[PDB]
Design a protein around this ligand. Structure first.
Ligand SMILES: Nc1ncnc2c1ncn2[C@@H]1O[C@H](CSCC[C@H](N)C(=O)O)[C@@H](O)[C@H]1O
Length: 327
DNA sequence: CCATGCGCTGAC
DNA sequence: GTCAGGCATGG
């Protein structure tokens, strides 16, 4: 994460829905805002959260009486994506995990906050001939809010990882906000090799498979892109090897393969996966954040998460707009 | 609860 | 042609 000097959101309140590790809380707090309510139903996600923030989130949002929820100015939500991803079955609104958006709509109807801030995968903007996106837009306009949306890549915002996601921002109509803008990209200067831990700490993660087929030559000059150098088995998900002189592939939550969830990399002459701390760094978390004692739950948590840096820039732009009020 | 080999989709 | 992005079943 980055350091923020000018605290644009001081004085405001927000809620943390579909919480996870709490990536949305770290970003809004750095800008000055206060959290007054959080929700998340996973047993192990509730444990890490409490370890880092000192409070246990409330359970299953579908059984909560929205009238029970505190007053607030901004609603934060990074809802489930398994039903919308190109790696799954694209069932969408017909999937048991695909109707969470309607619970959000229901809460907004009662609480009517100033801003609603959501996040999902890239394919959300295309799914079902574009019907899925128009439905989200229409619901929001019907509730008296404006609708801004765009797809952004983490490699353009200072983090060495190829992660393309859609971001959706909505302002209440009586506020007449006419000057909101997504942030502008900038040159990358950090690569995978610059975030690695020492060899004496990851010996246990090295893999030696005899069906390895090196297909490309290592590069000596860094680049802002993924550079494949070889393969194992048939070369499907989790069986591909990359150079640390480029950028990292997308981290995942339910993925398989011998190099599961992180992918494989070439370090000092051998092939290995990434460690939980190296995972925290490619998502922008600081070294002071405590990871879960179970290595398996830690990999899954980081794979479902958000890149903090991209959220800090966007949150600052929301505040700049709310603060411009001339006579 | 944890490990791993797919086997297809989308955007080129 | 090329390559990046959860499900099913084993135990
Ligand atoms: N019905 C429900 N009630 C509460 N939490 C739910 C839920 N259905 C799914 N979830 C939670 O929604 C989360 C979506 S992934 C979100 C990660 C979070 N933005 C982060 O900053 O790390 C998962 O952790 C999942 O356990």
């Amino acid at each position: 994460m980055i350091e923020i000097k000018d605290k644009q959101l001081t004085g405001l309140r927000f809620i943390d829905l579909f919480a996870g590790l709490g990536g949305f809380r770290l970003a809004l707090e750095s800008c000055g805002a206060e959290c007054v309510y959080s929700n998340e139903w996973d047993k192990y996600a509730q444990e890490v959260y409490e370890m880092n923030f000192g409070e246990k989130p409330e359970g299953d949002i579908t059984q909560v009486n929205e009238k029970t929820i505190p007053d607030h100015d901004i609603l934060c939500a990074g809802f489930p994506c398994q039903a919308f991803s190109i790696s799954g079955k694209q069932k969408g609104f017909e999937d048991s995990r695909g109707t969470l958006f309607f619970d959000i709509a229901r809460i907004v109807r009662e609480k009517k906050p100033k801003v609603v801030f959501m996040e999902n995968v890239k394919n959300f903007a295309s799914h079902d001939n574009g019907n899925t996106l128009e439905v989200v837009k229409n619901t929001m306009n019907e509730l008296d809010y404006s609708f801004h949306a765009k797809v952004l890549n983490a490699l353009d915002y200072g983090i060495p990882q190829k992660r393309e996601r859609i971001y959706m921002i909505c302002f209440r109509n009586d506020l007449n906000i006419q000057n909101f803008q997504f942030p502008k990209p900038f040159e990358l200067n950090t690569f995978v090799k610059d975030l690695l831990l020492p060899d004496s700490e990851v010996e246990h993660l090295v893999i030696d498979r005899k069906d390895l087929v090196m297909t490309n030559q290592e590069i000596e000059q860094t680049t802002p892109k993924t550079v494949r150098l070889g393969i194992v088995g048939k070369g499907g998900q989790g069986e591909r090897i990359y150079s640390t002189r480029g950028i990292a592939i997308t981290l995942s939550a339910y993925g398989g393969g011998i190099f599961a969830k992180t992918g494989g990399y070439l370090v000092n002459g051998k092939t290995r996966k990434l460690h939980p701390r190296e995972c925290a760094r490619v998502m922008g978390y600081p070294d002071s954040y405590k990871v879960h004692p179970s290595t398996s739950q830690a990999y899954k948590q980081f794979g479902n998460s958000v890149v903090i840096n991209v959220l800090q820039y966007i949150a600052y732009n929301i505040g700049s707009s709310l603060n411009f009020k001339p006579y």
